Structure formats: C-alpha cells, structure tokens
Amino acid sequence: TASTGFAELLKDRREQVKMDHAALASLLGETPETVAAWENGEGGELTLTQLGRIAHVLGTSIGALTPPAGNDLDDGVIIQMPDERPILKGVRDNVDYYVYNCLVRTKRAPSLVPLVVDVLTDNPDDAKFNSGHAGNEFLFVLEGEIHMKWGDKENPKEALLPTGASMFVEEHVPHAFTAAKGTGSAKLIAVNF
Amino acid sequence: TASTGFAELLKDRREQVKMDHAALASLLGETPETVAAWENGEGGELTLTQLGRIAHVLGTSIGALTPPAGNDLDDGVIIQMPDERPILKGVRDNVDYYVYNCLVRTKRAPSLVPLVVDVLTDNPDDAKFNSGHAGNEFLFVLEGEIHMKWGDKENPKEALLPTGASMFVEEHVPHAFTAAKGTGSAKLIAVNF
Amino acid sequence: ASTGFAELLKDRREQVKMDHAALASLLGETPETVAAWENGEGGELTLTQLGRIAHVLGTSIGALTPPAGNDLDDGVIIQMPDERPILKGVRDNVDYYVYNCLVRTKRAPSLVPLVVDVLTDNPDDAKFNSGHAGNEFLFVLEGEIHMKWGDKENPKEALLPTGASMFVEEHVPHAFTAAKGTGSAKLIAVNF
Amino acid sequence: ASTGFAELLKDRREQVKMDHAALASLLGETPETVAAWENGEGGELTLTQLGRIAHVLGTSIGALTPPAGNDLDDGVIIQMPDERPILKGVRDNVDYYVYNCLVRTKRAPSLVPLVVDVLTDNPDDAKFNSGHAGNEFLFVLEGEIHMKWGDKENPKEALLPTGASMFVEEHVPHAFTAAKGTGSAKLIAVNF
Ligand SMILES: C[C@H](O)CP(=O)(O)O
Ligand SMILES: C[C@H](O)CP(=O)(O)O
Ligand SMILES: C[C@H](O)CP(=O)(O)O
Ligand SMILES: C[C@H](O)CP(=O)(O)O
Ligand SMILES: [Fe+2]
Ligand SMILES: [Fe+2]
Ligand SMILES: [Fe+2]
Ligand SMILES: [Fe+2]
Structure with a gap:
C-alpha cells in the first residue's frame, strides 16, 4: 500500500522528469536494479531520510511520492x-x-x-x-x-x-x-x- | 466593493495578458475611455452577460475578475x-x-x-x-x-x-x-x- | 453565463437551505423574480446586484458564475x-x-x-x-x-x-x- | 526531513487530540519513542512504518513530511x-x-x-x-x-x-x- 503507492508514484515521477533507471540511480549512487526494485514495490524498508534523498534528486517532496490517506468508508x-x-x-x-x-x-x-x-x-x-x-x-x-x-x-x-x-x-x-x-x-x- | 474589486482585477488581468485599453476595447467593441472607466471603478452597472463577454475576451472566467466573498468576522x-x-x-x-x-x-x-x-x-x-x-x-x-x-x-x-x-x-x-x-x-x- | 448562473444559483440556494421566498425576502425581491433567475433570466443583473446576491448567500460572485469554458x-x-x-x-x-x-x-x-x-x-x-x-x-x-x-x-x-x-x-x-x-x-x- | 516530520507529527498529534501515550498505544510503541520522533529522531523510520503512523493519525504520509524545499x-x-x-x-x-x-x-x-x-x-x-x-x-x-x-x-x-x-x-x-x-x-x- 504505502510500498505499492510509492512504487507507482516513483515511476510516474521518474518518467515526468525524463530520467531512466540509470540516470536516477547514477544520481542517487544506487544501481539500476535497485531503483527498479523500488518501482517493483520493494521500497517498504526505505528510511525517512532516504525517501528525503530520493524526493530531492527528483526535485519534489516525499508527499508527492507517497499515496493519499486511503479509504475507510x-x-x-x-x-x-x-x-x-x-x-x-x-x-x-x-x-x-x-x-x-x-x-x-x-x-x-x-x-x-x-x-x-x-x-x-x-x-x-x-x-x-x-x-x-x-x-x-x-x-x-x-x-x-x-x-x-x-x-x-x-x-x-x-x-x-x-x-x-x-x-x-x-x-x-x-x-x-x-x-x-x-x-x-x-x-x-x-x-x- | 464588487465594483471596486472588479476594477482592480480587471486591470490585473488586462496587464497579465498583455493588452492595453485599446486592444481590449477594440476586441470588445468599446472605447478606450470606456474600458478605462471600468478600471476606474465605474463598472457597477455592467450586466451579467456583458461581464461574460469581458471574461471571454480576456480568456478567463467572471470569478477571476470578481473579488472574494469578503470579511464578516x-x-x-x-x-x-x-x-x-x-x-x-x-x-x-x-x-x-x-x-x-x-x-x-x-x-x-x-x-x-x-x-x-x-x-x-x-x-x-x-x-x-x-x-x-x-x-x-x-x-x-x-x-x-x-x-x-x-x-x-x-x-x-x-x-x-x-x-x-x-x-x-x-x-x-x-x-x-x-x-x-x-x-x-x-x-x-x-x-x- | 446566464444559464451557468441559473444552475449555480439554485445549487447554492438549496445548499444554505433557502427556498425562493426566503431568498427573495432577504433581497427585497419577489419569489417569482428569483425563480426566473433560476430559469436563466438573470442576464441583465448588474455587477453590483450580483455582488449583493452573493453576499446574502454568504459566498462570492465567482462561486455563482460558471468556469471560463472550453475552447479546445x-x-x-x-x-x-x-x-x-x-x-x-x-x-x-x-x-x-x-x-x-x-x-x-x-x-x-x-x-x-x-x-x-x-x-x-x-x-x-x-x-x-x-x-x-x-x-x-x-x-x-x-x-x-x-x-x-x-x-x-x-x-x-x-x-x-x-x-x-x-x-x-x-x-x-x-x-x-x-x-x-x-x-x-x-x-x-x-x-x- | 527528520526535522520536518518531527514538527508536522507534533502538530497533527495535537490536532486530533492525542497525547504521547495515546499515540504510542495505538502504534504498539512507547511514549518515549514518540517523544524522540517529535524530537527529530525519526530519520530511520521506514516507508511502511510511516504509512502506519499516518493511518493511525487519520492522514497521509505526505501531510506529515515537509514540502519539497527551496533551491532559489x-x-x-x-x-x-x-x-x-x-x-x-x-x-x-x-x-x-x-x-x-x-x-x-x-x-x-x-x-x-x-x-x-x-x-x-x-x-x-x-x-x-x-x-x-x-x-x-x-x-x-x-x-x-x-x-x-x-x-x-x-x-x-x-x-x-x-x-x-x-x-x-x-x-x-x-x-x-x-x-x-x-x-x-x-x-x-x-x-x-
Ligand atoms: C513531446 C512530447 O510532448 C514529449 P512526451 O510527453 O511524449 O514525453
Ligand atoms: C520579460 C518579462 O518577463 C516580461 P514582464 O513580466 O516584465 O512583463
Ligand atoms: C439531514 C440531512 O443531511 C439534510 P439533507 O442533506 O438531506 O438536506
Ligand atoms: C475548545 C477549544 O476550541 C478546544 P482547543 O482548540 O482550545 O484545543
Ligand atoms: Fe507530452
Ligand atoms: Fe515577468
Ligand atoms: Fe445531507
Ligand atoms: Fe480550538
């Protein structure tokens, strides 16, 4: 959910700013396979600080990379x-x-x-x-x-x-x-x- | 107030879309003196329909040319x-x-x-x-x-x-x-x- | 513009729980006049009048007029x-x-x-x-x-x-x- | 990020009328842990944890993290x-x-x-x-x-x-x- 939403919004954002797994990774000091992992839905254990680093490189906020509150109705x-x-x-x-x-x-x-x-x-x-x-x-x-x-x-x-x-x-x-x-x-x- | 706010928002909008009294007037079939009148605060008796015409030529809505609700607190x-x-x-x-x-x-x-x-x-x-x-x-x-x-x-x-x-x-x-x-x-x- | 007003006016009137008579009394108008505005006959209302109608309805002229429109x-x-x-x-x-x-x-x-x-x-x-x-x-x-x-x-x-x-x-x-x-x-x- | 969270977390906790103990109980954490997060010590919280904290606080992760920032x-x-x-x-x-x-x-x-x-x-x-x-x-x-x-x-x-x-x-x-x-x-x- 948090993990899932993140994966989707991460890809949405990476694509709107014209970066491929490589450029983003290169920019974040990570491997393309890692960044792909995040976009696969495996970002669940990323820390608050690391999420900050990611939002930064992507010129946006954590909020824009995380899903809305959800439905409880x-x-x-x-x-x-x-x-x-x-x-x-x-x-x-x-x-x-x-x-x-x-x-x-x-x-x-x-x-x-x-x-x-x-x-x-x-x-x-x-x-x-x-x-x-x-x-x-x-x-x-x-x-x-x-x-x-x-x-x-x-x-x-x-x-x-x-x-x-x-x-x-x-x-x-x-x-x-x-x-x-x-x-x-x-x-x-x-x-x- | 309605009249005043309109006058201010009209000028604000006319200037953001790069029109002078003439171009706007020419575009609306009015006289530069008339359009200046509106910006002087004399637009009070403009009809709903005419306000529509004005918003149109200015590529926006009546709402954007009229003031917010006001303060009653x-x-x-x-x-x-x-x-x-x-x-x-x-x-x-x-x-x-x-x-x-x-x-x-x-x-x-x-x-x-x-x-x-x-x-x-x-x-x-x-x-x-x-x-x-x-x-x-x-x-x-x-x-x-x-x-x-x-x-x-x-x-x-x-x-x-x-x-x-x-x-x-x-x-x-x-x-x-x-x-x-x-x-x-x-x-x-x-x-x- | 006239039609947009008509629809947005009716929506807002109901929102604040006002019937035609209530709104008319507050404005010094008759219920038939309000019904006509809501029937698309508001085109001749002035900028000042619209300002008064909005005030009585606790909102702005903008909330009662329709969006810019489409030209695409x-x-x-x-x-x-x-x-x-x-x-x-x-x-x-x-x-x-x-x-x-x-x-x-x-x-x-x-x-x-x-x-x-x-x-x-x-x-x-x-x-x-x-x-x-x-x-x-x-x-x-x-x-x-x-x-x-x-x-x-x-x-x-x-x-x-x-x-x-x-x-x-x-x-x-x-x-x-x-x-x-x-x-x-x-x-x-x-x-x- | 850590500091922004700390401030936004405290604001939201008070908003919904929750003291440290109340929030901690709902999360299965201790009040001291919550106080530390509010003290800027939340940097190591995971994406999943933050999601749970937001849920308990009836909001989104976004409402608890700071705006993009300034680079002008x-x-x-x-x-x-x-x-x-x-x-x-x-x-x-x-x-x-x-x-x-x-x-x-x-x-x-x-x-x-x-x-x-x-x-x-x-x-x-x-x-x-x-x-x-x-x-x-x-x-x-x-x-x-x-x-x-x-x-x-x-x-x-x-x-x-x-x-x-x-x-x-x-x-x-x-x-x-x-x-x-x-x-x-x-x-x-x-x-x-
Ligand atoms: C030129 C196009 O607008 C760029 P695209 O949106 O297809 O990425
Ligand atoms: C070039 C400038 O950006 C145009 P101005 O905003 O001064 O009208
Ligand atoms: C009590 C109800 O909520 C009032 P209605 O919305 O049906 O007008
Ligand atoms: C009744 C008060 O509005 C509750 P407070 O805002 O002071 O916490
Ligand atoms: Fe495009
Ligand atoms: Fe400029
Ligand atoms: Fe209702
Ligand atoms: Fe209060």
Whole structure:
C-alpha cells in the first residue's frame, strides 16, 4: 500500500522528469536494479531520510511520492457509537481544563476533527488561552452556559453564550472557554475542518 | 466593493495578458475611455452577460475578475444566539420531513453550512431520500434515536443511531433520515463543509 | 453565463437551505423574480446586484458564475506564428519590450506564453517591473540576455547566453536587456 | 526531513487530540519513542512504518513530511545551455526524441520544461504516448512539425511551421514527427 503507492508514484515521477533507471540511480549512487526494485514495490524498508534523498534528486517532496490517506468508508459513510469515543483529558497550566471526547473521523477528510468538549472550569478570571491553531473551528453549545474569550490574551474580547449558541473562530485566532461564572461546567461540540 | 474589486482585477488581468485599453476595447467593441472607466471603478452597472463577454475576451472566467466573498468576522469570530436562527421547513413528496434551523455561517468559509435538523417523520418504511449533494457532511445525534438510510434508494444500507452517535457521509452519497420506528421524532446537528 | 448562473444559483440556494421566498425576502425581491433567475433570466443583473446576491448567500460572485469554458479541439488548441497579438511595451518613456502573444486557453487562464523581444541593450538603464503574480519560465531564444532581479537598487544579476533557461518565482521583480551594446535579444516567457 | 516530520507529527498529534501515550498505544510503541520522533529522531523510520503512523493519525504520509524545499537564489534559479541533462527516448525500438532538460525547481515540482528534438520524419510511423498528467505548452523551435493527437487509430492532425505554439490538455495522448522527409525538427515543451 504505502510500498505499492510509492512504487507507482516513483515511476510516474521518474518518467515526468525524463530520467531512466540509470540516470536516477547514477544520481542517487544506487544501481539500476535497485531503483527498479523500488518501482517493483520493494521500497517498504526505505528510511525517512532516504525517501528525503530520493524526493530531492527528483526535485519534489516525499508527499508527492507517497499515496493519499486511503479509504475507510462503508459505501460512503462511517459511523461512531457514543461509547467508542477516544478520550483525552486536557491539562492547561496544571489545571484540568477540558476533556476531549473525540467523535467520528475519516481518512477521506483528514482535517475534520469533530469533538464534544467538556468545559471543566467555571472561573472566567482564570481562562487559559491557547495560542491559536491551524484550521477553522465551528462550535455549538450543547449544554450549560459558556464564557468565551478570544483575541489578545492580555486584552481579549468576550461573549456569554447560552445553550444552542453557534460560533465560528477563524484559524490562528487564540481562544479560551470556561463555564459561565460559578455554574460549574458546560459542554460543547467543536468541529475543526 | 464588487465594483471596486472588479476594477482592480480587471486591470490585473488586462496587464497579465498583455493588452492595453485599446486592444481590449477594440476586441470588445468599446472605447478606450470606456474600458478605462471600468478600471476606474465605474463598472457597477455592467450586466451579467456583458461581464461574460469581458471574461471571454480576456480568456478567463467572471470569478477571476470578481473579488472574494469578503470579511464578516469580529477579530476572527462570529456568533449566533439560539433565537436568531433562520428556519426552513423542508417538504419531501408533500410530506413535512425535516425542519432546518440554520446555525452560524461566514463568508470566510462559504462551504460551512451548520444546521440543527428536526427529523419529523418516524416511519423507516417511508424514508424519503435525497439524490445526494456536493460537499461532505458531519452529523451528530442531538436527541432521540435516528434511523439512517444511505446508498441506493431501492436497496440501501441502514443504521440505528442512539443519542450521541456521530456520522460522516461523503459527498454525492444519497441519504435519508427518520426517527427510530414509532418514537415520533429526533434531532441532529448537521455540518456541511 | 446566464444559464451557468441559473444552475449555480439554485445549487447554492438549496445548499444554505433557502427556498425562493426566503431568498427573495432577504433581497427585497419577489419569489417569482428569483425563480426566473433560476430559469436563466438573470442576464441583465448588474455587477453590483450580483455582488449583493452573493453576499446574502454568504459566498462570492465567482462561486455563482460558471468556469471560463472550453475552447479546445479535443484537448488541443493551436496558433500559427502569423496570427498572434502584439503589444509594444514602454517603460518610463522607452520601447522596452515588444510582446508577441502565443497560444492561450480558457482551460488554463493562468497560462500566458510569449516571445518577448528585449529591445534595449544598456544594463545601466535596465527598467524593472515590480514583480507580478504567478511564476515564470524563461528561455533565451536569441542573442545574449543580461538579467537583473530583486531590489532595483541592490539587484542580483547574471549574463545569459542563447539557450539558457531560468525560473522567476512570483512577485520577485525583474528586468532584462540585451548584453551591453549588442542591440537586442529575444526570449520565450511562460507565465503559469 | 527528520526535522520536518518531527514538527508536522507534533502538530497533527495535537490536532486530533492525542497525547504521547495515546499515540504510542495505538502504534504498539512507547511514549518515549514518540517523544524522540517529535524530537527529530525519526530519520530511520521506514516507508511502511510511516504509512502506519499516518493511518493511525487519520492522514497521509505526505501531510506529515515537509514540502519539497527551496533551491532559489532570491526567487530565481538559472541553467546554462551546457549544464543540462539529456535522455534519449526510444519508442517501440526507435530513437524518437532526445530530451534536453531545462531548468527545474523544488518550488514548482510540476514545472518540467524541455527542448525536445523530434528525430523521426515519417508521420505514418508516428509513435503515440498514452497521455500524461499535467498540461503542456509547446513551441516549434526549428523546422516544421507534424502533430498528431487523440485516438492513435483515429487521430486529429496538424502541420505546424517554425514559431507555431500549441496547448495539449492533460491525459490527451499525442505524437510528433518532423514534416514528412524533412529529417528532424525541434520544440520547446513546458509541462506545468
Ligand atoms: C475548545 C477549544 O476550541 C478546544 P482547543 O482548540 O482550545 O484545543
Ligand atoms: C439531514 C440531512 O443531511 C439534510 P439533507 O442533506 O438531506 O438536506
Ligand atoms: C520579460 C518579462 O518577463 C516580461 P514582464 O513580466 O516584465 O512583463
Ligand atoms: C513531446 C512530447 O510532448 C514529449 P512526451 O510527453 O511524449 O514525453
Ligand atoms: Fe480550538
Ligand atoms: Fe445531507
Ligand atoms: Fe515577468
Ligand atoms: Fe507530452
């Protein structure tokens, strides 16, 4: 698969840049038989570094010589039951801030990371910001009331969101969440796409 | 804005294809002063058809001569309260099938269409399929139990999903939802991205 | 254009879950008017109106208008050396280049190939541009080329003979002239 | 490569909300091993292993390896006419083309420009390829070119003189030969 895809993309690329097994090999200090081996599907044990060397000589990246993520769908769909969710308890400055209940994901859409996030803290004065992250994020308040903070960590804008509120935070925008003051905790669905 | 952006992109494009006001005008049967007018920001009343003519002569599309959607965010975010959601009641074969409660949207991410969908029907035998649609869709069961159908309308695969189940349906894949048999109705959050 | 709009408009309207009435209300129009646009009767809408329609639909005019289109003869388009447009380029008052525009296609709008005649031959009076979108491949067709790039006040430079090839990343400003006192040179420039 | 992986691996791990222990468990590795990879010590991982790591992280090997890289001198790279690679292409047992490879760059991997010597001159024995990814711009450098394209058994054709330019959409199969009995011709081919 990785090995197979590599073999195909290696040949595709070698041929688009006008090299034969010899020129490529000569260029990489390998034997034509070796390079042919790789194109036969025997490149599985090539190291990350060697793959780098190969991509270099071929004027491209490892990515362009490796296959796409692959298909994990059943006739177009994938399902996840409520009790098979992976769980990570997020700590921020030695404080148990959030609990990430990871929802369904798919190799067909790598950037889709949907989550149910338990917001453990309920003291807006102590909101712990992140530094922003790549990818846009859609949020929805599943329950309780949320105190949202965003922008500059020292002088941030704020918003109090009741159950049912929907939000969007552009990529790289730093943000932090807590339950409404004294309400203990709240919950939300977060969709990174 | 539309007028302004057009003026800028028109000049950018005219210059990349090596035309002066005259050649372009001559080519479009207009006067150099007219074409200069458009590049001055006076193209606002140009019709869709005329824009088509212009894109054609310039060997490109209207899209490439018009500005991107624009920015509607407050320092990176946009919020929607639970009671300002637009509402459309979807009818399928003269049956009130779903109720779409549209959540927050943004011109910064045009393809993001998040929704809370009330699933009105509760008779799996009468599920009304759609023919599939562009764009991938993430689903989450907010409440009740959902009876999902997908694939061929005549011989579809099925799944019974309890509250908290998350799903993904690849683009173009036809699908239909109903509440679990006899349970009356269910609800879900649907995120098209 | 009208027909493309009609189809793309309907697709986008359904995408955001809007029926004719909903869209019409937001635009101050009537549902019948929206139905007509979706029926191919939108040709007379103005650039400003289209901008408003796109805004209401949370997208761009571009997402509602059709792609450039096709102008190929089964994947191919040709251009005879005598049927090509010419543009005499002048910079700061001097015939600097002459642009002989080669084949272009609606299927790849960004492809702008050209035979450029480098008219001047004094590298000291070389006249820079200020960079441009898109990368550019160049090949010295004839004569010798004196290339300058980067900061017009602190440029990197190179003397290139016939047959030399080069790549100029987008935005990087650059300038060319024939080798000092050699009259003129020629190059093929492919912007993609 | 090792350092790029290290950074991209950490970004992706956090993205899917996985700590070192979670990732290690899924891979049957120890958290210390994962921390080392994220510390730049992943150079010895195999193609197969990387494939497994990507799978577990719901993505591709490509999303975890760094971009091609930079090889430009302030946005520009040059190639003298004498420092270019050559590949003598043979089709069905006959020297058909000679490929004189022009400048390429890691900043635009798909750009493959070339001076191609069309060696044969019998359009009847024209030898097709089977189309290829990417579009291609062509310019007749010298002599007269006889172009064929489409279905090798039911082809469209055109006789092109020096200076003619053409565009061939991706996948469209094609073949070239010098005009009947004229020995050979030459063309610049830019795949982008
Ligand atoms: C809820 C938050 O969006 C989760 P984070 O991005 O801060 O990890
Ligand atoms: C819930 C469904 O996904 C809404 P539809 O795509 O059928 O309009
Ligand atoms: C030769 C140059 O590349 C043409 P310019 O981009 O300056 O228009
Ligand atoms: C001239 C041709 O375009 C080169 P080929 O693509 O057949 O390798
Ligand atoms: Fe976040
Ligand atoms: Fe749907
Ligand atoms: Fe240029
Ligand atoms: Fe080709």
